[PDB]
Structures are given as C-alpha cells and as structure tokens.
C-alpha cells in the first residue's frame with residue numbers, strides 16, 4: 001500500500017464531472033474543479049486543466065495525470081508550510097501518508113485548523129491525537145474516511161485500508 005492506492009480508495013474514480021460530498025464540481029480522482037455553483041465554470045476549469053475541449057468528460061489517463069499532479073502538490077504544500085513541515089518530518093512513512101490524505105482532501109487551510117491534533121501527533125501521543133482529530137466537522141461530515149485516516153495515525157499500519 002501507498003499514498004496513491006490509499007487516496008484512490010478514498011476518493012474513487014469518475015470520468016465525468018460530478019459533485020463531491022460538499023456539492024462541488026469535481027472529476028477524476030477527487031480533483032476539485034471549482035466551488036462555483038456554475039457548471040459552465042466547471043467545464044471551463046476542466047478544459048483549462050486538461051488542455052483541450054473535453055465537454056465534461058476525460059480519459060483514465062487524463063484522470064491519472066491530474067492525480068499525480070495533485071499528490072505532488074499536496075506534498076509540496078506540506079513541505080512549504082512552516083507549521084506543517086515539522087510535523088510531517090517527525091512522522092514515520094505510514095503516518096505521513098495519513099497527513100498527505102488530509103491535506104489532499106482539505107487543503108492547507110482545513111489542515112491548519114487541526115493545530116492541536118498536530119501537536120499531539122508531533123509528540124507521538126497516538127490515542128490522544130485520534131480522540132482530538134475526531135472532534136471536528138471533518139469527522140462528523142465524512143465519518144468512514146475520517147475513521148480510516150485516524151486509525152492510520154493511531155496505529156502506524158494500513159489495517160484500515162486492508
């Protein structure tokens with residue numbers, strides 16, 4: 001197991017524009033297009049991303065390509081952040097993947113608000129962090145996924161993905 005397989009499981013794969021759990025236009029493997037309620041705006045963003053007139057539909061290869069870029073950007077987003085980097089650096093390889101998944105799902109900003117849980121993760125207080133992470137809109141809104149990530153932080157293994 002790895003980051004890619006992990007998120008592929010969490011986000012699925014769709015080749016046609018769709019609305020995510022928050023109702024935003026997305027495509028591929030959790031690739032957010034826009035927070036705009038406009039579909040045309042979504043189509044436009046999609047075409048811009050792909051480099052062609054897609055008409056709201058892409059190929060598997062294209063999805064994969066967005067996905068690789070998005071994973072890469074997430075990691076970089078972490079590394080570029082002064083508050084995130086240190087956390088990320090203190091962790092083992094499995095736990096890091098947990099951190100990248102949250103980052104992918106929620107962006108720098110969302111991740112930002114877990115300051116307290118982050119401190120705990122940094123101190124290696126596993127069970128406490130798991131408890132703190134659970135006290136969040138994030139857990140209340142996407143419980144099954146949240147549970148998978150949380151277990152991952154808690155145990156340092158991939159058991160929730162097996």
Ligand SMILES: [Cl-]
Nearest residue numbers: 048049050069
């Ligand atoms: Cl893009």
Ligand SMILES: [Cl-]
Nearest residue numbers: 142143144145
């Ligand atoms: Cl969920």
